[PDB]
Amino acid sequence: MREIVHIQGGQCGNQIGAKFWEVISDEHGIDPTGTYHGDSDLQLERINVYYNEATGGRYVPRAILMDLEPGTMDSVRAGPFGQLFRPDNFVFGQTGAGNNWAKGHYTEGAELIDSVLDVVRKEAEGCDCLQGFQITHSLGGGTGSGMGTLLISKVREEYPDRIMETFSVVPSPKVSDTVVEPYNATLSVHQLVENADECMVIDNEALYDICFRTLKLTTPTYGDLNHLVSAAMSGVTCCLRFPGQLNSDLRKLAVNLIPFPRLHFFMIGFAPLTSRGSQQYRALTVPELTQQMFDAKNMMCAADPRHGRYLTASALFRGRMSTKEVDEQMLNVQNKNSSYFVEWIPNNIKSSICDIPPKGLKMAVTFVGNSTAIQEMFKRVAEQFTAMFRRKAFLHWYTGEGMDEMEFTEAESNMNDLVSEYQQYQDATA
Amino acid sequence: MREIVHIQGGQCGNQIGAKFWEVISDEHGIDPTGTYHGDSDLQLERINVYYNEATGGRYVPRAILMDLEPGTMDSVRAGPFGQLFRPDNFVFGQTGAGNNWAKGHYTEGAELIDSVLDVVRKEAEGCDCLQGFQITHSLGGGTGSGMGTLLISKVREEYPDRIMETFSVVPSPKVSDTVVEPYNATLSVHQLVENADECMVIDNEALYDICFRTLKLTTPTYGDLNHLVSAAMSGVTCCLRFPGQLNSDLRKLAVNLIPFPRLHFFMIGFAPLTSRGSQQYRALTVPELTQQMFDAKNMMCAADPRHGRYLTASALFRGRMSTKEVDEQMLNVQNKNSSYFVEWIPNNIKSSICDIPPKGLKMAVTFVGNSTAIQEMFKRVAEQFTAMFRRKAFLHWYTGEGMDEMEFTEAESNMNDLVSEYQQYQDATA
Amino acid sequence: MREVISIHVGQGGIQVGNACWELFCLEHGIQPDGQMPDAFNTFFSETGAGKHVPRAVFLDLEPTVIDEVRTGTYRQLFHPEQLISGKEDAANNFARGHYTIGKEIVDLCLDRIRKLADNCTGLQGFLVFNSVGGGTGSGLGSLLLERLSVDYGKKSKLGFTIYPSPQVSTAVVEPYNSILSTHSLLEHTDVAVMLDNEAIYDICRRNLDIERPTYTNLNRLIAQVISSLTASLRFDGALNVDITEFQTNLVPYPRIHFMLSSYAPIISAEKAYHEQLSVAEITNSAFEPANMMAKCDPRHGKYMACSMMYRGDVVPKDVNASIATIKTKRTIQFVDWCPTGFKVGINYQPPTVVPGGDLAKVMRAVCMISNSTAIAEVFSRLDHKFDLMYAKRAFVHWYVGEGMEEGEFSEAREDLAALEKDYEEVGIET
Amino acid sequence: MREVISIHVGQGGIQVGNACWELFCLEHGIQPDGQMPDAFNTFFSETGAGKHVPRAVFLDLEPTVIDEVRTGTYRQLFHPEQLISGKEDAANNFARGHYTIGKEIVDLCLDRIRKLADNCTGLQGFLVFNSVGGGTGSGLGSLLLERLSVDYGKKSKLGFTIYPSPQVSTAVVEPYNSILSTHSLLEHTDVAVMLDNEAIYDICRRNLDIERPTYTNLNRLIAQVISSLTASLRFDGALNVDITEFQTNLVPYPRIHFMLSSYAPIISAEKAYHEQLSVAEITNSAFEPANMMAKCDPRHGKYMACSMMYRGDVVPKDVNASIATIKTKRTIQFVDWCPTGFKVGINYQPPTVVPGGDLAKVMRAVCMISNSTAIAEVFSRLDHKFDLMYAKRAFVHWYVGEGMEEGEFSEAREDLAALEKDYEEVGIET
Ligand SMILES: Nc1nc2c(ncn2[C@@H]2O[C@H](COP(=O)(O)OP(=O)(O)OP(=O)(O)O)[C@@H](O)[C@H]2O)c(=O)[nH]1
Ligand SMILES: Nc1nc2c(ncn2[C@@H]2O[C@H](COP(=O)(O)OP(=O)(O)OP(=O)(O)O)[C@@H](O)[C@H]2O)c(=O)[nH]1
Ligand SMILES: Nc1nc2c(ncn2[C@@H]2O[C@H](COP(=O)(O)OP(=O)(O)O)[C@@H](O)[C@H]2O)c(=O)[nH]1
Ligand SMILES: Nc1nc2c(ncn2[C@@H]2O[C@H](COP(=O)(O)OP(=O)(O)O)[C@@H](O)[C@H]2O)c(=O)[nH]1
Ligand SMILES: [Mg+2]
Ligand SMILES: [Mg+2]
C-alpha cells in the first residue's frame, strides 16, 4: 500500500538510479536475478512499495527509464543489477538534444513523450493506493532538464492530488562541465517551482568536498557520489517500508516542512560518515549523530547554512534508540543555536524514529532542512545567466527551434522574484 | 459432437491453413506423424471436433484443399505437419486462373468444382452432428475469390440451416501486389454478403503494422502473419473444445453479434501481444488484457474503430479467472467510452470464459466486434473500382469468358447500397 | 506438370538462345553433356535414364550459326533434328522469309512444335526470340506466330523482340521490315518486350565499366532477365506469379501490350561488396530512367501498370515500405484511372552466376516489367525513318519482286498511325 | 545506432585520411584485410559475414594518390567504387575545381553519399578533410558543402581545414583560393578547426625531438586528435559528449565557429616514463601557447569557450582541481560575458599506439578544442597577402578564363572585412 513509482531521465538521473536500485535491492536481499535470499521476515512485508510481482516468484522494479539517446541505457543494462529493469520500460530516441533545452522540450521531447507517458499511465493506474512519484534528473543537461520538467507538468495535470518528489542536481560554478549550463538551469527552475511538491538540490561540488574532507579518500569517482546520493534517497522513505515508533510518510513531511506553497527547496545530508581508518575509533551515540547532522560541511549543497536562518528542520533517525534522548538532543540543538532559527515559528524541528537500521550500521540519520541560505545558489545562477544573456551569446541555438527571448525574460524575472520572496521571510520579525 | 469441417482454397488460404493446423495439432499434442503424445486428459475428450479417427490409432484432419494449380499443395505437403492431410482430399486443375475472376468462377472453376463438392458431401454426410463450415480464402486472387465464393453458394443451397464461416483477406490499397485486385474484390463482395453467415476481414497492412509496432520484430515474414491469424482463428472455437464457466458455440455468437442479417462483417484482434524483451516486464491481469483488447492498433484491420460506433462486441477470455472482475471491467470499458457505443441497444458486449489457456500462456483473449467503422474499406475499394472501370481498363480479359459489364454495374450498385445501409444505423437515434 | 517451349529464329535469336541455355543448364546443375553428375521439368524433359533434352527449337535459313552450335561443347545436348536449318539466307529481305523460302521450311518447324507439345501435359505457353531488323528473323517469326495463333488458339505467346536503336544501326533497310513485323505481331502476340541494343550498351558502360563490349555481354543480361521472369515457375516462393497471370495485370486493352524492362542490381565483384545492396536502394535503381533496358525516357509519359519480380532473401514488408517511397516521389506519376499499379512477386532462390561472366554473386535482385505511355516515341521515330525512304519508293523493288504486293506497305503505316492515336487517347485523364 | 561519414578530398585530405584509417583499424582490432581475426558501428558497417567496410569516401581529380591507395596493403579494405578519381587535375586553380571539372564529378560523389547515408539509421553528422591551399581540394570541398547543405539541411558538418602558415608556403597563389574557400565555408560549415603546418612542425621539433619530419608524422598527430574527439561515441565514459552537443557550447554566434586545437601529452618512449604524467601537468601543458596546433598566440586575445576532452583513468575531482588552477592564473583571461567557459568530457579508453610511430603509450591524455578571439590575426595576415597581389590584378587571368566573374574576388574581401569587424565587436566588454 501507499507505494510510489520511479521515473528517471537523462544520463545523470540514470546513473543515480543505477545505484539507488542496487542499494534498495541489497537492503531487501534481492539478488541481481530477482530472487529473494533475505534473512528477516520484515524484508518482505512491505516489498510492494518499490517492487512488482511476476510469475515465477521474481521481483521487478516499477521504474521508467527515458533518454533522448540510447547509449546510457544500453550501458546501464550491462552493469550489476541491470537485469531487474523490465525491457518494455526502456524508451529512447535516435537523435538526442545536445545539451539544448529547446530541443529537449519543444521539438524532440514533445513527440517522444507520448510513449513514455503511456507506460507511466499504465504503471500508475494499476497500483493499489498511489502515494506519489519521485523524479531524478539533472539541471545541467538539455534533454534531462527539458523532458523531465515537461513530464512533471504533464503528470501534475493528471494527478493533482498526489505528491511529487524531485531530486535535482543544479550546475555549480566551481565544477563546470558545460558552457550552456546557466541557460537550461534558469529555464528549468522556472517550470520546476510551479509543479513540484518537493525539490531537493544536490551539488557535485559539495559531494567532492565531503568525499575529500570527511571520508578522506584519495580518488573520488562518480560511484561514490552516486552511493552517497543513494543512501540519502533511501533514508527518506525508510519508515514507510519498516515499522517504527513514529511512522511518517512523505505527505507528513510535506505538511510539516513547507510553510508556504512556493518554498519547497530543501538541502539534505546524511550521517554518520567516517573514514575507513577511523571507523573503529568512533562510538555511535545520538549526540555523535546529531552533532554531525547539523554540521555545515555535511550538507549535500555548497550553500552555507550559517549564512541564514532555518525556517524548519526534519530528522529521520534509524535503529533502535530511546525517544527521550532524541527529543532532549533536538531541544538542545535548538537552544544553543537560537540565532540561526527563525523566531516567529516555535518548535520548528520534526523528528521520527525507525527501528530498522541500514545494513551494516547500527544507527543512521537523514536530515532535511528548509533554510533561507539556499538563496545564494539562485543568486549566482542568475548572475551567470544575466552575464551571458546581455550579449545574446549562444541564443541563436535556442531561438532557431521556436523559442524566443520573451520566455527568457519571464524566466529571469520569476526566478529573481522567487529569490526576493524567499529572503523576505528571513528579515521578517514578530 | 457439433463439429465442423475445414475447407480452404487458393494459395493464401492454403498457407493460412498450413499454420492453423500446426497450431491445432500443437494444442492437442498431436505429433506430425498423427500419434497422440499429450499430457492432459482433456486433450482427447473433444478431439472429434477437427480430427477423424482411422485404423492404427492415428488422427487425420477433415480438411479439404482445393486450388486451380498444383504448386501450392505440392509445396505444403513437404512442410511440417504436411503428412496429416489425407491425399484423397487434394483436388487441383492443370491450368490455373491467372488472377482472373471470370476464369475461376465461370469457365474453369465450374467444371472442376464437382469433384471437390463430392468429397465435401462425403465429409459432411458422415459426421455425428454438423455445426458448420469455416472457409479461408483471399479476395485479392482470381481462382480463390471465384471458386471459393461459388462453393459458398453451392454449400448454402444444400445446407440452409447450418452455419457458415469465412475468413477473408481483402486487398488493401497500401500494400498492393496485384493490379486487378479491385475487380475481383468488388465482384466477390457482391456474392459474399448473400450467402456467408459470418465474415471476418483480415488485412496484410494491419498485420505488418502490428508486427512492427507491438511485437517490434525487425523482419516480419508471412510466417508471423499466418501465426497471428492462426491464433485468432483458434481462439474463436476454444470453448467448444474445452470446458468453461460459460460455453458459447459459434451459433450463440451469431445470435448475439448480428442485429440484421446483412450486417455480418466483423474485425478481430488477439491479446496479449508483447515483444521478446518486454515479456518479463509485463504482468498478465484482466485489466491489462482488456486495455490491449480495445486498443485501436490491435485490430487485425486498418479500419480505425474510433471513427465509428460499435453496434456490438464480443470477448472470449481464456484461462482460469474470476467472473466478477471480467464483468466489472466490461462495464467499465463501456462507461468510459459511451460516445463510441450505439445508444439504442444497451449492454452490447458479450463475454465468455474458458478454463483452458493456450499452451505457454496463462491468459488470452479473442475479440470480435461488429462496428460501423468498416465502411471505410468498402469505400476505398469501390473508389479504386470506379476509378479503373470508367475507362474499361482490363475489362476485355473478363468479357472474353462470357461475363458482361452489367454484372459489374449490379455488383457496384449492391456494394454501394451495402455501404450506405451499413452507415444508416450509425446516425440512427432513439 | 508445368511446361514452356522457347522458339529461337534468326542469328540474334540463336545467339541469345545460346546465352540463356548456358544459364539454365548451370542453374539446374546439368552438365553441358546433358547428364547430371523436380524443378528441371519446366524447361527440360526426362529421357528415362540419364540425359535431359531442352524444350527448345532453333531456326535459321543461313547454316553458319547452327553449324557452330552443332560443333561446340553443347553438341550432345540438343536433339540432332530440332536444329532446323535452311540453305539460302533471306538477306535482310522481309518478303523473302515470308513468301519465298520460309514457307518451305515452316512445315518442318510446325511438325517439331507438335512433336514437342504432345509430350507436355501442363503447357503454360510459348516463348519466342527474334531480332526484328533482319529478313529471316522477322519474316519467319511473323509466319510462325500466324500459324500458331490458329493451330493452338488461346495459348499464350511471349515475344522478346530487339528493335533497332534510335540512331545506331547496322543495316540500312531495317525500318521497312521492322514496321512490317510490328504490323504482323501487333494482332498476334500477347506480350512484346523492348530490347534495343543502345540502352544495354549504356548500361554495360556505366555499371559494368566495360568499354569494349560484345554481343555476348548483352545476351547474358537478357538471359538473366529471362531467368528472373521464369524463376517463379520452378522454385518455391512466398508470392508466386504465373505466365497466365499477366494479361489480367499489365495489359489494360488488347492492343496495348508493348512494355519495357529494367534490371537491378548490375555491378561487378570489384566494388559490389563495399555496399549493402538493401532492397530499397535496388528498387530505387530499377526505376531510374537511365537503367531502362530500352532507350526510352519514362519521364516523358505516364505509367499504366508495373509488374516487378524480386528474388533472394527479401521480406514483403521491406517491399511495401519501398513501394510507398516510390508512390511518394513527384517525378514518377501514374495514370489517373489506375490507383494501384504494382504487382509484386517474391522468390527465394538468389540469381545464379555464370563463371567468367560480368555479374557478381548477390543475395537480392529485382526485375521489373513496366507498361508505360512513353513507348510511343520509338514508334514515332521508326515511322519518321520509314516515311523518308517510302516517299521516293526506295528499295521497294527488292520487295515487290519477291511476291509482295505494292499496297502492303501502306496498311502497316495505317496500323502504326492507329496505334499512336490509341496511345494518345489512353493517356488523357478523365 | 550512431554513425558518422568522413569525406576526404584532395591530396592532403587523402593523405590524412590514410593516417586516420590506420589508427581506427588498429584501435578496433580490424586487420588491414578488413577481417577480425559493438563499438565498430560508428565508423564501419557489417557486411553480414566477415569483412567491415569504412564509412568513408575518397575524392581527387589527380589519379596518382588513389592509385597508390588501391595498390597498398589496404587495397582489400575500401569498396572499389567509392574511391572516385578524375583524369585532369585542377592545378591549384580554384575556378577549375568549382566551375569546370568538379561539376562533372560531383554528381557521382553525391550518389555515393546517398548510398552510404541510406544504410545509416542514427547519422550523427559528416566529417570533411581538405587542404585549403589547393585547387581541387578547396573547390570540391566548397561545392560538396554547398550541395550537402541543401540536400540534407540541418545535419552537422565538421571541417578540418589546413590553412597556410604565416610565412612558410609551398605555392605562390594559395592566398587567393584560401580566401575564396573561407568565403564559401563561412556560411556553410558548422565547425572549422585550424591546422596549419608550421605549428605542428614546431611541436614535433620541440617535443618529439625529430629534426627531419615528413608529412606522415603530422598526419599521425592529426589522426590522434580525431580519435580523441570521436572516442566518446564508441566507448563507455563517466561524462559523455556528442557531436550535436557543440554548437550549444562552443559557438556563441552563428558566424563565429573557427577555433584552434591542442593536444597533450606529446612525448617519446625514451623519456616518457621518467615522469609521472599527472593530470594537472598535462592540462597545464595543453594550455601552453607554444603547444597550440595552429600558429596563433592565445595571449593576444580573450577566450570565449573551452571544450576539452580527457581519456584514460582520470578522475573528475582531479579535473576540477586543475580547472580551478587555470582560472587562478593571471596570464589567461576569459571574456566578460562568460563566467564559466569549460566543458569537460571524461572517457575510460586510453589512447592507442601505432607501431613504428612517434608517440609512446600513456594512460592519460587531454585534447582541447578552444574558441578564442585571437584567431583574427590569421585572417588579417591572409588579407594583407591577398591585397598585395590583387592591387595589380596579378594571376587573375588564370581565374577569369575558367568561368569565374571579375567581381567574385571583391565580395570575399568584404566578407573577411565583416568577419574581422565582428571579431572585434564581440571581444569588447560591456
Ligand atoms: N542484341 C543482339 N542483337 C543482335 C545480335 N545479332 C544481331 N542482332 C541484331 O539483329 C539485326 C539484324 O538481324 P540479324 O539477327 O543479325 O539477322 P537475321 O535476323 O538472321 O536476318 P538475316 O539477315 O536475313 O539473316 C541487327 O540490326 C542487330 O542489331 C546479337 O547477338 N544480340
Ligand atoms: N598537413 C598536411 N598538409 C598538406 C599535405 N599535403 C599537402 N598539404 C598542403 O596542401 C596545400 C596544397 O594543396 P594539396 O593538398 O597539396 O593539393 P590539392 O588540395 O589536391 O589541390 P591540387 O593542387 O589542385 O591537386 C599545400 O600548401 C600543403 O601545405 C599533407 O600531407 N599534410
Ligand atoms: N553524480 C553523478 N553526476 C554525474 C554523472 N555523470 C554526469 N554527471 C553530472 O551531470 C552533468 C552533465 O549532465 P548531462 O549528462 O549532460 O545530462 P543529460 O543532458 O540529460 O544527458 C555534469 O555536470 C556532471 O556533473 C554521474 O555518474 N554521477
Ligand atoms: N498471410 C499471408 N498472405 C499471403 C501469403 N501469400 C500470399 N498472400 C496474400 O495473397 C495475395 C495474393 O493472392 P493469390 O496468391 O493470388 O491468391 P490465389 O489467386 O487464390 O492463388 C497477396 O496480396 C498477398 O498479400 C501468405 O503466405 N500469408
Ligand atoms: Mg543471318
Ligand atoms: Mg593534387
XYZ file of C-alpha atoms in Angstrom, chain A residues 11 69-71 75 92-95 97-100 103 173-180 182 208 212 218-222 384 387-388 390-397, chain D residues 1 122 124 236-240 244-254 305-306 315-317 320-321 324 337-344 346 425-426 428-430:
82
model
C 22.359 10.350 -18.148
C 19.949 8.851 -26.768
C 20.284 5.067 -26.357
C 23.870 4.866 -25.087
C 25.313 0.745 -20.780
C 14.614 6.313 -26.204
C 15.038 8.453 -29.296
C 17.551 8.311 -32.127
C 18.728 11.935 -32.201
C 19.300 17.013 -27.589
C 22.946 18.104 -27.436
C 22.500 19.900 -24.094
C 19.999 22.221 -25.803
C 15.342 20.675 -28.477
C 30.005 27.451 -10.939
C 33.047 25.786 -9.343
C 32.993 22.465 -11.212
C 31.558 23.400 -14.613
C 31.425 20.799 -17.389
C 29.099 22.600 -19.828
C 29.187 26.197 -21.047
C 25.423 26.468 -21.595
C 23.068 28.731 -16.880
C 33.567 16.254 -3.758
C 37.741 14.786 0.343
C 42.208 9.794 -2.170
C 40.413 9.387 -5.518
C 36.677 10.145 -5.573
C 34.671 8.846 -8.510
C 31.078 9.148 -9.669
C 25.928 33.987 -14.662
C 26.226 37.978 -17.604
C 25.828 35.652 -20.596
C 23.176 40.520 -22.102
C 25.322 39.787 -25.172
C 22.835 37.228 -26.597
C 25.567 34.603 -26.578
C 24.531 31.125 -27.767
C 20.981 32.472 -28.078
C 20.542 31.508 -31.742
C 20.640 27.781 -30.927
C 22.911 3.015 -33.842
C 21.345 7.213 -36.491
C 25.219 11.993 -36.227
C 31.927 3.966 -22.238
C 32.640 7.101 -20.233
C 31.689 8.837 -16.996
C 30.925 12.129 -18.779
C 29.934 11.703 -22.415
C 25.467 17.637 -31.699
C 26.398 18.990 -28.252
C 28.875 21.511 -29.687
C 27.078 24.473 -31.259
C 25.307 24.840 -27.903
C 28.618 25.105 -26.019
C 31.428 26.434 -28.266
C 29.619 28.635 -30.810
C 28.326 31.867 -29.226
C 27.067 33.245 -32.552
C 26.364 31.657 -35.949
C 34.651 28.870 -24.548
C 36.887 25.856 -23.972
C 39.028 11.154 -12.003
C 36.619 14.136 -12.201
C 37.761 15.686 -8.912
C 38.029 20.210 -11.243
C 41.107 20.845 -9.087
C 40.437 25.930 -10.692
C 30.110 37.856 -20.587
C 31.218 34.234 -19.959
C 31.546 33.330 -16.262
C 32.132 29.632 -16.861
C 33.675 28.581 -20.147
C 34.745 24.967 -19.678
C 33.015 21.865 -20.981
C 34.654 18.695 -19.694
C 35.955 12.053 -19.475
C 32.845 43.805 -31.852
C 32.394 40.610 -29.825
C 34.818 44.300 -26.193
C 33.496 44.239 -22.639
C 30.102 45.653 -21.692
